[model samples]
Target: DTDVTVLGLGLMGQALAGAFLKDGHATTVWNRSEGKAGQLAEQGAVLASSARDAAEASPLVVVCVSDHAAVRAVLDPLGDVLAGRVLVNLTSGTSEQARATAEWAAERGITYLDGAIMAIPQVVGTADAFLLYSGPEAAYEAHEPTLRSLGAGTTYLGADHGLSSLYDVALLGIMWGTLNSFLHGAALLGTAKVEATTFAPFANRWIEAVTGFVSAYAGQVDQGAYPALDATIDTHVATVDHLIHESEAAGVNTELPRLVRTLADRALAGGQGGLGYAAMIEQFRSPS
Candidate 1:
């Protein structure tokens, strides 16, 4: 019997199928578009004639497609065949979409697992890859070993059904925010004829220091207390204004620094001016 069948032959899906095949699992594959599975078929993967055939071939069915709508397009028709198999969807979508999809699968007696692939295609099946899964604990336990074939850091994020997608998007927000800040910094330094390469080491050092600040603030935030351990909101407002003025002088975009100033200004107006910067969380917790 095939151990797993991967649906949708997108780059990610192909990497998943290849990982299973390399692990010597009896793997079956199918794609909505016919020609996408040709190369994998040559790598000892059995290309299914239809979606039903693919679902029937394996006890586990892993899907990674373009979106939630694409996932529904592929599996909705094969609902009956997918009834008893474990369905793991790695498609990127909102937490709401994942919850709705899980409910859809449950109504048909399908064992559903929502997943997030944190690593890129090239890193799949390696120690560097991190895959997060959320679903029935029993199903995750049963397939944990097989799933680890795709990555070393395979994590189970409880049975919330939406945790994987929620965490995925949250993590990506951090990634983009950090990147945009770095770009803004590079732009500011460029005015002084300084290279980004020359500024990177100090930027990295600041990030490391900031990590400790976050750790300290996390506890203060959860406890509903913001003692001015290192810096106060008043100091933050002044620094942010200096950043805005510096950016303006350097002909760099002031949007990023201005955004920080707005946030700090709000916190100051809210009587948090004497508290720590983490107290700004209170301002964010409410609408502007």
Candidate 2:
């Protein structure tokens, strides 16, 4: 019997199958289009003629199609064939779609696990790859050994299948926010003929310091309390104003710092100016 079956031979899918094969698992693979599985075939992967054939080849099936709809199109007809087997979806989607898929899988006899891959395809199966799963504890445990082949940073969030998707987006938001700030900083520094490479080391060190702030603020956010451990919102607003003025004087974009001031202005208007910077969390907790 095949140890694992991977459906969808996209770049990410190929890396996944390659990892399993490298780990010596009897892997079966299938994709909607042909030719994508040839390299894998050369690597000793069993190429299934159809999706059903692939699912039937292994008790643990991993589906990493383009989207939730693609996942349904491939597996909706295979309920009978996949019954009693563990179906792990590493596809990127919303929490709603993940929960909905879990419900659909429950109606059949399929054990479902919703997953999110934080790393890109090239990092799959490596220590740099981080994968998250959320589903039934028993199902995750049963296939944990096989799934561990995908990455060293594999994690199980909780029983809520939506959690993996939720964490995926939240982490992505952090990535974009950090990158945007860096780009804005680079643009400002560019005015003085400074290269991004010269400024990157400082940005990286500050980012490391920001993580400490994140950890400290998380506890205050959860406790619904804001203590001025370092500086109050009023003090932060002064620095934000300085950033906006500097951007304006440097002829660089002022939008990022203006947005920062806008949010802080709202908190100041709400009489939270004396609270700590963590008080800004309230602004994000609700719609504008």
Candidate 3:
């Protein structure tokens, strides 16, 4: 059996241990509260009374503590015992903190890999849990077996210790942005006695179509050019009337849509109607 160690007895810590133990690894776990890992211990995990014991038991240490601060609180006391060992941290934290922790590990001669668990505890052992890992290539290579025990689709982002958390925040921005749009749309429809359920299909399809527009816009944004190859601002302005008419006719809210069109109207009037859509970014910036 592969030997692995776990620190922290929180939900995700227990989940990590459960995954490793289920994969036939002789997992050793340590937590401040002895009873917190009772079920995992029953499932064949060795319980360590101290962090140093767990660190000494295996070449691989998996920490899923509260956060960056909590990770330090738990393992800092172990000192140089961590040298020459691989420390995979699945604690929630920022890209900056990830870098800081990586530096901390380097100073202590520990191989550190910053990771993020993208799934819930119930699915940790299944294919649904595709965790993100970022660290030195050798550290990732060393833990490949233990990682697959968490899930088959695990991704190694890069050698940067902070890349996993960086993308974690990026993905979250995408979630909130899309959710806000849908919630706002639902609120507008509800004013007309239309339940969100009925409108969801249309919104879903519209989003699929909008995804294409985004793909096309990305190159333009990066290039600093908004060639409205599809349609000029003047032509697009004509469609605003139809939206306003429908919103007003249906007694739905029009404020947000109007303000959106207002920006386009002003941009077109400023002689950017013929330029690409990325020209709109100029308007978004504050006046200096």
TM-score of each: 0.90, 0.93, 0.74
Best by TM-score: 2
- Give the lDDT ranking, best first: 2, 1, 3
Write one digit per residue (lDDT tens) for candidate 3, span 163-224: 99998887777777787668767876887878999999998999999888788877887888
Q: Looking at candidate 1, what is the lDDT of residue 281?
A: 82
For candidate 2, write residues 219-269 as lDDT tens digits: 999999998989999999899999989998999898888889998999999
**Candidate 1 runs further than 4 Å off:** none
For each candidate, how many residue pairs have backbone atoms clashing (under 3 Å)? Answer: 0, 0, 4
* Pairs with steric clashes in candidate 3: 226-276, 226-277, 227-276, 228-276
Clashing residue pairs in candidate 1, if any?
none
Superposed Cα RMSD, model 2? 1.8
Candidate 3 global CA lDDT score:
0.85
Task: Evaluate residue 169 in candidate 3 and report its C-alpha lDDT on the 0 to 100 scale.
Answer: 80
Query: What is residue 103's positional error in candidate 1, in angstroms?
Result: 1.5
lDDT of 1 by residue, 48-137 (tens): 998889889999999999999998899889889988889999999999999999999999999999999998888999999999999999
